[PDB]
């Protein structure tokens, strides 16, 4: 299983520039942080659940918050990308739980936000006052607003009187019955339709 | 140990730069120390040598010979001192080349550009000593 039948020597990529590229990336990050100070170096991201049945046990960071999440948090969609919040217009909220989690995330960020006035001599009422502008800040939203609990807890404890009775017949029999019903959903519907037609014909 | 990224410790590049330096660089390369009296007078250790300076040879076979500098052969990286000569076969006098780092300057050829050089070198020396002290 050796794929060396093409002119492979023309397209060999070595990586001797790995430490140099790491140094260049760190220099670029330092320059971006110095240019963006006192703002954090990154944008606030929502918590999303990974697709497919393999990865839906785990949550991670998404692209941006939804318009519904911004509306429920009270943050206008034009103000949001100017105060460090990422916006994603494609994503929708199919269920209430993720919507509530991301709305609470936005409200925590809004409670921790310090908003400097556009003009120092003319502050507005949406702006943070000068007596509150001084506080210990964070510069990594991926760290301070990360995924705290990416998986469910793998172990809890309950009293022995709170042990559930379980599904009737057993979980194995419940799984077998669910698979059988899914396989026979159409045949039983056709049989019921034929029986109803026969009953209507010979009532 | 060198630190700055623009400094090269390459022997090949250093020798190339030294032996292909232009004339204004070779003037600085052909620097000579001052005597003890001139150092305590001017607070200056070294200066680029020039024609008309009086020097004393402290290295080589012509040690303890003194004389005025009559030529600064920058192409050969050498100076000529008066009466530090040899005879050819015919007996005619030919000057003997002395590298400027083998001599010590005993009397500077003084003009206002030279006083400006000495004054700014001295002022930099006292500024550096005061800042570090």
């Amino acid at each position: 299983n050796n794929h060396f039948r093409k002119h492979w020597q023309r397209r060999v990529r070595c990586h001797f520039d790995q430490p140099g590229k790491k140094v260049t990336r760190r220099l670029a990050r330092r320059a971006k942080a110095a240019a963006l100070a006192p703002r954090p170096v990154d944008k606030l991201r929502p918590i999303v659940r990974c697709p497919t049945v393999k990865y839906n046990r785990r949550t991670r960071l998404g692209r941006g918050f939804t318009l519904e999440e911004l509306k429920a948090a009270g943050i206008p969609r034009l103000l949001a990308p100017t105060i460090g919040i990422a916006v994603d217009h494609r994503r929708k909220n199919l269920s209430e739980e993720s919507l509530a989690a991301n709305v609470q995330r936005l409200k925590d960020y809004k409670a921790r936000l310090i908003l400097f006035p556009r003009k120092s001599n003319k502050p507005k009422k949406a702006d943070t006052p000068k007596d509150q502008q001084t506080a210990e800040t964070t510069t990594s939203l991926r760290t301070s607003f990360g995924v705290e609990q990416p998986l469910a807890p793998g172990f809890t404890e309950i009293s022995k009187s709170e042990i559930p009775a379980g599904i009737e017949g057993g979980a194995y029999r419940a799984l077998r019955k669910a698979r059988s019903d899914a396989r026979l959903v159409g045949v039983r519907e056709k049989r019921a339709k034929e029986k109803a037609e026969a009953e209507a014909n010979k009532k | 140990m060198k630190v700055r990224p623009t400094v090269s410790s390459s022997r090949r590049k250093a020798r190339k730069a030294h032996f292909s330096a232009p004339s204004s660089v070779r003037r600085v390369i052909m620097s000579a120390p001052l005597s003890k009296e001139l150092r305590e007078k001017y607070n200056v250790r070294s200066i680029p040598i020039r024609k008309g300076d009086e020097v004393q040879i402290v290295r080589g076979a012509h040690k303890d010979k003194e004389g005025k500098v009559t030529s600064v052969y920058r192409l050969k990286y050498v100076i000529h001192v008066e009466r530090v000569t040899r005879e050819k076969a015919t007996g005619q006098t030919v000057p003997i080349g002395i590298h400027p780092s083998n001599v010590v300057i005993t009397k500077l050829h003084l003009d206002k550009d030279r006083e400006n050089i000495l004054a700014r070198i001295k002022a930099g020396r006292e500024q550096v000593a005061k800042a570090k002290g």
């Binding site: 060999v12 070595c14 001797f16 | 140990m1 410790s9 390459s10 022997r11």
Partner: protein, 260 residues
């Protein structure tokens, strides 16, 4: 270069009665014409199996084995015979491992090279420093043209705590030949066992010797290894009462008389 030996137009003259079938440079009017080309035996040809940059230059080592080797080198640095066997002059050192008070190094106390040199002489690393100073020699070979001009011995290694002792001692110790510095949380096996030989002479600060236990507690995934031998004194084991009381009587001596 991948094109070396192949920037030439050459073709074989075929089987004949006169010359070998190596390809020969075409054309005429010059010395190169009719000369052999492309062969590893040919002058101005291509070398056999030309060297490539995708050779394996780097070696991946298990981090646990790196930590094992570093711990072994640190343990070997506390054995005074191993320091002499590695060539350090430690006859005037008052104690091994040598721990200096952090008041003598912290802040700017040894930020000057004269102060650092005086401290080394006072604590007893002086003969090792002068050994390095007198050991300087010109290297034999082409390393002189390739930028490795001189060779000298290794001297003491100063280990300090950057949090408590600061970092001006690095500048203070920098200009002394053979003296190296290293933070206690970033110990280097290439310094702890120079040339693969155990027993580097180390001068510790008290802050570093305090912080070493926390340093080895903070290494996650690694524990200090258990030895396969509990008692290294083989003479004590062999000449103990427990072994000797159950042995068979000797069946001979170290020298055997010739019978016939």
């Amino acid at each position: 270069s991948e094109k070396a030996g192949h920037q030439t137009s050459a073709e074989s003259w075929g089987t004949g009665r006169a010359v070998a079938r190596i390809p020969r440079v075409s054309g005429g009017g010059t010395h190169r014409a009719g000369q052999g080309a492309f062969g590893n035996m040919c002058r101005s040809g291509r070398m056999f199996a030309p060297t490539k940059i995708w050779r394996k230059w780097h070696v991946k080592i298990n981090q646990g084995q790196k930590r094992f080797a570093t711990a072994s080198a640190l343990a070997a640095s506390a054995v005074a015979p191993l320091l002499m066997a590695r060539g350090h002059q430690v006859s005037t050192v008052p104690e091994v491992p040598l721990v200096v008070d952090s008041a003598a190094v912290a802040g700017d106390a040894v930020a000057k090279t004269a102060a650092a040199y005086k401290l080394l002489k006072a604590i007893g690393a002086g003969p090792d420093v002068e050994k390095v100073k007198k050991s300087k020699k010109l290297r034999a070979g082409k390393g002189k043209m390739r930028g490795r001009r001189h060779r000298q011995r290794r001297g003491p290694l100063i280990v300090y705590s950057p949090e408590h002792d600061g970092k001006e001692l690095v500048k203070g110790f920098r200009n002394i030949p053979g003296v190296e510095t290293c933070p206690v949380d970033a110990l280097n096996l290439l310094q702890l066992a120079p040339g693969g030989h155990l027993g580097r002479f180390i001068v510790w600060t008290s802050a570093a010797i305090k912080q070493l236990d926390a340093v080895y507690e903070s290494k996650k995934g690694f524990f200090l290894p258990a030895n396969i031998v509990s008692q290294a004194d083989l003479s004590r084991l062999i000449n103990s009462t427990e072994i000797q009381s159950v042995l068979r009587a000797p069946k001979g001596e170290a020298r055997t008389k010739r019978a016939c």
